[PDB]
Amino acid sequence: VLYVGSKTKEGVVHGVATVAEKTKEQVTNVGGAVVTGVTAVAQKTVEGAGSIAAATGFVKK
Amino acid sequence: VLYVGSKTKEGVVHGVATVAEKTKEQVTNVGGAVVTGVTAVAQKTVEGAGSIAAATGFVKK
Amino acid sequence: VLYVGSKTKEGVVHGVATVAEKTKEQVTNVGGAVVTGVTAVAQKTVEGAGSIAAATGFVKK
Amino acid sequence: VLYVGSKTKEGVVHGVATVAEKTKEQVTNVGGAVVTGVTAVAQKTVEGAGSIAAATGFVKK
Amino acid sequence: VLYVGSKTKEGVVHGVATVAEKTKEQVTNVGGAVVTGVTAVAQKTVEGAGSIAAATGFVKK
Amino acid sequence: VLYVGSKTKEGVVHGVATVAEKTKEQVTNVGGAVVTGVTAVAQKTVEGAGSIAAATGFVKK
Amino acid sequence: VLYVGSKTKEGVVHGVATVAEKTKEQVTNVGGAVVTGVTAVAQKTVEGAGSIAAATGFVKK
Amino acid sequence: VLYVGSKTKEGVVHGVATVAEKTKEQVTNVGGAVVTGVTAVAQKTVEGAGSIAAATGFVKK
Ligand SMILES: Cc1ccc2c(c1)sc(-c1ccc(N(C)C)cc1)[n+]2C
Ligand SMILES: Cc1ccc2c(c1)sc(-c1ccc(N(C)C)cc1)[n+]2C
Ligand SMILES: Cc1ccc2c(c1)sc(-c1ccc(N(C)C)cc1)[n+]2C
Ligand SMILES: Cc1ccc2c(c1)sc(-c1ccc(N(C)C)cc1)[n+]2C
Ligand SMILES: Cc1ccc2c(c1)sc(-c1ccc(N(C)C)cc1)[n+]2C
Ligand SMILES: Cc1ccc2c(c1)sc(-c1ccc(N(C)C)cc1)[n+]2C
Ligand SMILES: Cc1ccc2c(c1)sc(-c1ccc(N(C)C)cc1)[n+]2C
Ligand SMILES: Cc1ccc2c(c1)sc(-c1ccc(N(C)C)cc1)[n+]2C
DSSP states (O other): OOOBOOSOEEEEEEEEEEEEEEEEEEEEEESSEEEEEEEEEEEEEESSOEEEEEEEOOBOO | OOOBOOSOEEEEEEEEEEEEEEEEEEEEEESSEEEEEEEEEEEEEESSOEEEEEEEOOBOO | OOOBOOSOEEEEEEEEEEEEEEEEEEEEEESSEEEEEEEEEEEEEESSOEEEEEEEOOBOO | OOOBOOSOEEEEEEEEEEEEEEEEEEEEEESSEEEEEEEEEEEEEESSOEEEEEEEOOBOO | OOOBOOSOEEEEEEEEEEEEEEEEEEEEEESSEEEEEEEEEEEEEESSOEEEEEEEOOBOO | OOOBOOSOEEEEEEEEEEEEEEEEEEEEEESSEEEEEEEEEEEEEESSOEEEEEEEOOBOO | OOOBOOSOEEEEEEEEEEEEEEEEEEEEEESSEEEEEEEEEEEEEESSOEEEEEEEOOBOO | OOOBOOSOEEEEEEEEEEEEEEEEEEEEEESSEEEEEEEEEEEEEESSOEEEEEEEOOBOO
16 A cells, blocks of 8 residues: 555666668568567556567468 | 655666668568567557567458 | 565666677568567566567467 | 565666677578577566567467 | 779778766866867878877976 | 779778766866777878877976 | 779777776876776878877976 | 788777676876776877887886
């Protein structure tokens, strides 16, 4: 009955340095799912599913 | 009955430096799903599904 | 009845330095799922499934 | 009834330096699931399944 | 007699990302010389002295 | 008599990522010379002295 | 008489990632010379002295 | 008479990752010379003295 939060962190990203030097980056997709290059991502979910970088081929029900 | 939040963080991204030097970046998609290049993203969901970089091939019900 | 959080961390990423030098990066997908290059990702889920870099081939029910 | 958290850490990644020099990186997927290159990832799940880098071939029910 | 320069670089700085988070930065100088915080500086000198971040206490001739 | 330069580099800095998190940075100088924090600096000198981060106490001739 | 330079490098710095987390950084100088924190520095000198991070106490001639 | 340089390197630094976590860094100088923290430095000198991190107490001629 006396919750006291103070300077708390939940789902936090900080202090990120990235260098990426490429000559050729190619993605070829035929009927599927491709996720590429996810950087410095943060989230908080309450009462639900939390997905960040999810690829599902297909759902053929 | 006495929740006291103070300087709390939930789903936070800060301090991000990114350099990307590419000569050729190509994406070719035929009937699928492609997600590429997600940087410095933050969210908070209450009572729901929270997705950031999600690719689903297809839903053929 | 007297929860007192103070400077706590849950699902936190900080202080990350990355260099990536490639000449050719290629992804070829035919009806599947490919996830590539997930860096500096943090999340917190309450009452749900938490996935970061998940690839599912397909769901043929 | 008197939980007192102080400077605690749960699912935390910090102080990570990575260099990756490649001439050719290729992924070829035909109807499966491929996950590649997951770095500096942290999460905390309460009352749910927590997966980071999971690849499932397919679910044919 | 046939100098042919092509895409040459001399005194060049490029691709620099910097983050600096400080709570207190102080400089106290009494009769001296202080240089602080020189970032991403480039020069080319022909037939002369080239100095970038030089501090000389004093010249009492 | 047929100098042919092509894509040459002399005094070059590139691809630099820096993070600096400090609580207190102090410099106290009394009659001297202090140089601090020189990052990503490049120069080319022809027929002269080339100094980057030089501190001389004093010159009492 | 047929110098042919091609993709040559002289005094070059590239691909540098640095993280520095300090609580207290102090410099106290009384009549001397202090150099601190020189990162990712490159130079080329022709027919002269080349110094990068040089500290001289004093020159009392 | 037919010098042919090709993809040569002279005074080159590349691919450097550094993390430094300190609680207290102090320098106290009284009439001397202190050099501290030189990282990822490259130079090329022709017909001259090349010094990188040199500290001289004093020159009392
Ligand atoms: C007094 C009281 C009772 C419940 C209570 C709190 C305080 S604080 C809290 C909470 C719930 C979910 C989450 N996430 C989304 C990670 C974080 C915190 N609850 C559930
Ligand atoms: C007084 C009181 C009681 C409950 C309570 C709060 C305050 S604040 C809170 C909460 C709910 C969901 C989330 N997320 C979306 C992660 C974060 C915090 N609850 C559950
Ligand atoms: C007063 C009180 C009672 C319970 C309580 C809290 C405060 S805070 C908390 C909690 C719940 C889920 C999570 N995650 C999502 C890992 C982290 C913390 N509980 C369960
Ligand atoms: C007084 C009281 C009662 C329960 C209680 C606490 C305090 S704190 C806590 C807790 C639950 C889940 C997690 N994870 C998600 C790792 C971390 C902490 N519980 C369950
Ligand atoms: C045809 C010809 C002859 C000489 C010649 C050139 C072209 S270009 C050049 C030169 C001089 C100084 C410098 N710096 C300031 C480092 C760089 C290059 N020289 C000496
Ligand atoms: C034909 C010919 C003759 C001389 C000659 C060249 C070509 S190119 C060159 C030169 C001089 C100084 C420098 N630096 C400042 C490093 C770089 C290059 N020289 C001196
Ligand atoms: C045709 C010709 C003849 C001489 C010649 C060149 C080309 S290029 C060169 C040279 C001089 C100084 C330096 N530094 C400053 C290290 C690097 C290279 N030389 C001496
Ligand atoms: C044909 C010819 C004659 C001389 C000659 C060259 C080619 S190339 C070269 C040279 C001189 C100094 C340096 N440094 C500064 C390390 C590097 C290279 N020289 C002296």
